[PDB]
Amino acid sequence: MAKPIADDIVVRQVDVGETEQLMTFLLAHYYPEEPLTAGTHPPEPEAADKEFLLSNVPFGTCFVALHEGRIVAAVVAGPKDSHEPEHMAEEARKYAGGKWGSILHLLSAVETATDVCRRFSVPSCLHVHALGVDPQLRGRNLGGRLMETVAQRGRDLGHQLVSVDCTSVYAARLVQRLGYQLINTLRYVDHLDASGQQVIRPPPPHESVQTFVLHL
Numbered sequence: 389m390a391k392p393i394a395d396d397i398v399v400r401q402v403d404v405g406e407t408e409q410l411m412t413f414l415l416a417h418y419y420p421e422e423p424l425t426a427g428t429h430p431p432e433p434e435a436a437d438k439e440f441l442l443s444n445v446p447f448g449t450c451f452v453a454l455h456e457g458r459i460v461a462a463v464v465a466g467p468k469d470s471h472e473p474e475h476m477a478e479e480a481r482k483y484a485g486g487k488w489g490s491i492l493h494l495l496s497a498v499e500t501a502t503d504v505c506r507r508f509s510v511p512s513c514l515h516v517h518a519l520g521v522d523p524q525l526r527g528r529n530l531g532g533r534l535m536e537t538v539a540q541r542g543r544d545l546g547h548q549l550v551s552v553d554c555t556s557v558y559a560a561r562l563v564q565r566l567g568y569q570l571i572n573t574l575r576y577v578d579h580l581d582a583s584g585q586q587v588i589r590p591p592p593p594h595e596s597v598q599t600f601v602l603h604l
């Protein structure tokens with residue numbers, strides 16, 4: 389139920405009843421800086437974006453770090469299988485024209501390219517959809533501890549693989565030191581929509597989305 393990872397930080401599982409405080413934290417410290425969100429307009433995520441993240445909570449695969457009764461970091465993960473490339477591609481279509489559509493446009497291209505259940509001959513993968521740390525607590529292994537917690541949850545659940553799309557260079561550096569394997573790089577300047585326009589325009593130093601996997 390509770391994993392002390394410092395003297396004052398506790399890692400807890402998110403319950404289906406406590407999602408508002410998780411979304412408040414994400415809206416403050418995940419979405420404004422996450423490169424796909426920051427690289428598309430308007431700045432704030434669409435309802436369908438926020439609702440998709442929260443739809444992972446029933447899986448028991450979402451975790452927060454608590455300091456003095458408050459969320460200071462969070463990770464949102466959920467399962468996927470070999471249907472995910474077809475599903476994401478049709479979801480990207482459904483929302484084409486808006487912000488969530490643009491985000492899905494990129495993420496679907498990456499999912500199709502990586503296709504990790506077919507790639508590594510595994511029946512399923514635990515995919516990390518969001519990772520955020522309060523800026524005042526960054527550099528203190530909170531991202532790492534949350535990722536390790538997802539990996540252990542993945543092990544209990546029988547998953548043989550964890551995947552994550554590091555849209556941020558800081559997340560790429562984190563999972564590199566956790567020993568993840570880089571399997572795909574897509575530079576944002578290389579990803580166009582059908583009209584030939586760059587879909588995602590995030591601030592430097594975020595130049596690419598780098599997808600990593602960890603074998604469990």
Ligand SMILES: CC(C)(COP(=O)(O)OP(=O)(O)OC[C@H]1O[C@@H](n2cnc3c(N)ncnc32)[C@H](O)[C@@H]1OP(=O)(O)O)[C@@H](O)C(=O)NCCC(=O)NCCS
Pocket residue numbers: 417418419421422423518519520521522525526527528529530531532553554555556558559561562
């Ligand atoms: C990605 C993220 C969770 C990593 O934070 P973290 O786990 O605390 O990062 P690390 O422990 O690996 O810190 C390594 C160094 O990089 C810095 N660092 C981490 N994130 C940073 C960020 N957005 N911006 C600038 N520096 C950052 C740390 O302060 C630390 O530097 P220091 O040792 O001199 O103090 C965090 O950057 C974040 O929440 N970003 C906003 C949301 C986002 O982009 N999520 C993408 C998920 S793919």
